[PDB]
Structure 1
Amino acid sequence: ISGGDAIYSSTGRCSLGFNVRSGSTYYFLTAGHCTDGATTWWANSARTTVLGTTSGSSFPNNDYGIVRYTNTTIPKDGTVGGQDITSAANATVGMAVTRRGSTTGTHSGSVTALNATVNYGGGDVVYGMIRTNVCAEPGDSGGPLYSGTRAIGLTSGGSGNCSSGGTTFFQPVTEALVAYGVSVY
């Protein structure tokens, strides 16, 4: 399973952001809003292939969570779909990026702003977000934002849709990497 693939929790479906590891422990990052209140994650709708359990979740304020893998045999590719990812980097205004998610597949665009605040309401406010002109729809939360073989962010949310165009905000991946002491491979 790789970046952009569907993940299912108890309550719904999100997308895997990046496979990461620490030492010999494998994990995957996804959105914090998807990890919040989820314990176990599966690879399919039927909930028959287990992936693992949530190890951390940070949302609102930030929007990142991490799941430790407990399934021993499923392949954990360090890619996004077939794309290899070899490092993480900070987003910059005008950077060309690409997102992949379990609902809309792959879409590209550019970083239009940094450090934005997105208010999802109800006191769910997230800060520090990367703004872009890439579209995203329900189910794509937590999938990767990357540029080339560089990991850049995790889909958090925004507005619009892929038919008419939209605005999507991503959580900077460097920040989750550092919070958890893990790294892309």
Structure 2
Amino acid sequence: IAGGEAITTGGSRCSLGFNVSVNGVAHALTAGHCTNISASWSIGTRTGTSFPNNDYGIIRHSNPAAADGRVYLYNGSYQDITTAGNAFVGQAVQRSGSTTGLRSGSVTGLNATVNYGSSGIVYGMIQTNVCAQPGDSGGSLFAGSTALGLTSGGSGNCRTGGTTFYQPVTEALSAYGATVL
């Protein structure tokens, strides 16, 4: 399983953000509002979660051979990931997720505060003009082979278009001492 593919727990579905390594052990990053749901996932056991405030969580793989260091492009192809970086305003980006597949757009803001009402407030979010839908959360925000974020939320959808916010991937990596595969 690669970046942007479905990960579920009981009836819930989220998308995998990035396959990473912690002291050589294979794990996967995804959104924290996803991992708060349960410790048991199709791919393994949750070993960390942070939502709200942040929006990231981590799952250790039951099957290490499934830790595919790429992002699925939903066209029978994949993008290799080799590093993690920080987003910049005007950057050309892509987002891969299990509901809508691959979408593209550009970063329009950084360090954005997002109020999700009863779900709480998140801070320091990457802002883009890329669309997303329910099910797309936790999936990959990348630029080429550089990992940049995890889908959190937004407004709109993929037909009318909308605004999406992502948790910066480097803050999740440093939280857990992880490195992208």
Does structure 2 retain, via aligned residues, the 8 Å contact 1:60–1:124? Answer: yes
Structure-1 separation of matches of 2:24 and 2:154: 35
Letter aligned with residue 79 of structure 1: R
Normalized against structure 2, the TM-score is what?
0.95
Does structure 2 retain, via aligned residues, the 8 Å contact 1:11–1:38? Answer: no
Structure-2 separation of matches of 1:183 and 1:19: 9
Does structure 1 retain, via aligned residues, the 8 Å contact 2:61–2:67? Answer: no
The 1:89–1:67 alpha-carbon spacing in structure 2 relative to 1, beyond 3 Å, is same
Does structure 1 retain, via aligned residues, the 8 Å contact 2:49–2:58? Answer: yes
Greater than 6 Å deviation, 4+ residue runs: none
How many residues of Structure 1 are paired with residues of Structure 2 in the alignment?
176
Letter aligned with residue 23 of structure 2: G
Find out whether 1:116 has 2:112 as its counterpart: yes
User: Which residue of structure 2 lines up, in the alignment, with residue 56 of structure 1?
Assistant: 48
User: Which residue of structure 2 lines up, in the alignment, with residue 173 of structure 1?
Assistant: 169
* 3-state SS of paired residue (2:133): coil
Q: CA deviation at 1:21?
A: 0.4
1:101 to 91, 97, 100: 97
Structure-2 separation of matches of 1:147 and 1:38: 30
2:57 to 65, 74, 93: 65
Flag structure 2 segments of 5+ consecutive residues without an equivalent: 73-77
Q: Deviations over 1:117-169 (max 9, x none)?
A: 00001261000000000000010000000001000000000011011110000
* 3-state SS of paired residue (1:122): helix
Matches within 5 A, 1:1-185: 1-42=1-42, 51-72=43-64, 74-81=65-72, 82-122=78-118, 124-185=120-181
Structure-2 separation of matches of 1:119 and 1:141: 16
Structure-2 separation of matches of 1:133 and 1:123: 22
Q: Percent identity?
A: 64
The 1:123–1:2 alpha-carbon spacing in structure 2 relative to 1, beyond 3 Å, is closer
Structure-2 separation of matches of 1:172 and 1:77: 20
Q: Deviations over 1:67-111 (max 9, x none)?
A: 011225x52210001100100010110011000000100000000
Flag structure 1 segments of 5+ consecutive residues without an equivalent: 43-50
Q: CA deviation at 1:37?
A: 3.0
User: Which residue of structure 1 lines up, in the alignment, with residue 75 of structure 2?
Assistant: none
Normalized against structure 1, the TM-score is what?
0.93
* 3-state SS of paired residue (1:141): coil
Structure-2 separation of matches of 1:139 and 1:147: 21
Structure-2 separation of matches of 1:181 and 1:123: 27
